[model samples]
Target chain A: XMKXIEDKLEEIXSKXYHXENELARIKXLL
Target chain B: XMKXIEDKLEEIXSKXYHXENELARIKXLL
Candidate 1:
């Protein structure tokens, strides 16, 4: 949890920036 | 993590320096 900040940041932003369908799904999902 | 990782330390590795609590906390706050 404490470590892996870069990895986590990458994970947090990965698909949300692109992938219109996945982005739409994420908006509804989360 | 990449931003907090410093370029120098007296007896510590760069990785260990960034992993320290106080600096990490400060960086997180900033």
Candidate 2:
């Protein structure tokens, strides 16, 4: 369970980081 | 342990949602 949560958090946070970077890129463009 | 993970998932997901929204708003504004 702990490992599951750890993995899930990492996955989700990776998503968040990518999304934030994408948005920053878009904002940087416009 | 389960509820803690559940609550954390909820909290983290909520943060992701809000951050996404805020970034969208900024991109919308700028």
Candidate 3:
């Protein structure tokens, strides 16, 4: 229950971090 | 630049909604 929510939240956070890194990389190249 | 990131953010948000709905459905079944 709570664990499931936590895991999902972590997954979402991981995606956010992944996208942030990608954005930073693109900005660096621009 | 900003638009690209905003688009990415929206994608992330959509994923979040998808996962949240899934979680709710699972909980409802439980």
Candidate 4:
């Protein structure tokens, strides 16, 4: 994950919202 | 550390396989 919140926001234009349920589950497993 | 291991039970403590060699390195570079 990028340390900067601004970089994280910029990602939204190119990427879907990163808070998907399945992704959250995978991170929980990690 | 989980402070537990499947191997070496009740024997020598399992060492960290994952190393943090440069603990003081700047996080910005990462």
Interface RMSD of each: 14.6, 2.5, 15.9, 18.3
Q: Tens-digit lDDT track for model 3 on A1-30?
A: 755655565576687667556544644554
| Residue pairs in candidate 4 whose N, alpha carbon or C atoms collide under 3 angstroms | none
Candidate 4: tens digits of C-alpha lDDT, residues A1-30: 223334534543223332244344445545
* lDDT score at residue B1, model 3, on the 0-100 scale: 49
Q: Which stretches of candidate 3 lie over 4 Å from their true place?
A: A1-30
How displaced is residue A23 in candidate 2, in Å? 5.5
Instruction: Give DockQ per model, in order.
Output: 0.04, 0.29, 0.05, 0.03
Q: Tell me the whole-model lDDT of each prediction, alpha carbons only.
A: 0.40, 0.75, 0.60, 0.31
Q: Which candidate order results from sorting by lDDT in descending order?
A: 2, 3, 1, 4
Q: Per-residue lDDT for A1 in model 4? A: 24
For model 2, the stretches where C-alpha displacement exceeds 4 angstroms are none
TM-score, candidate 2, is: 0.63
Docking class of predicted structure 3: incorrect
Give the poorly placed runs of model 1, Cα more than 4 Å off.
Answer: A1-3, A18-20, A23-30, B1-30
Model 1 chain B is weakest, by summed lDDT over 10 consecutive residues, at B5-14
- Stronger candidate by lDDT (1 vs 4): 1
lDDT by residue for model 1 (B1-30), tens: 434323222213423343354344544445
* Residue B26 lDDT, candidate 3, scale 0-100: 48
Q: After superposition, how far is residue B8 of candidate 4 from its true place, in Å?
A: 40
True contacts kept of each: 0.04, 0.25, 0.07, 0.00
- Displacement of residue A14 (Cα, Å) in model 4 is 0.7
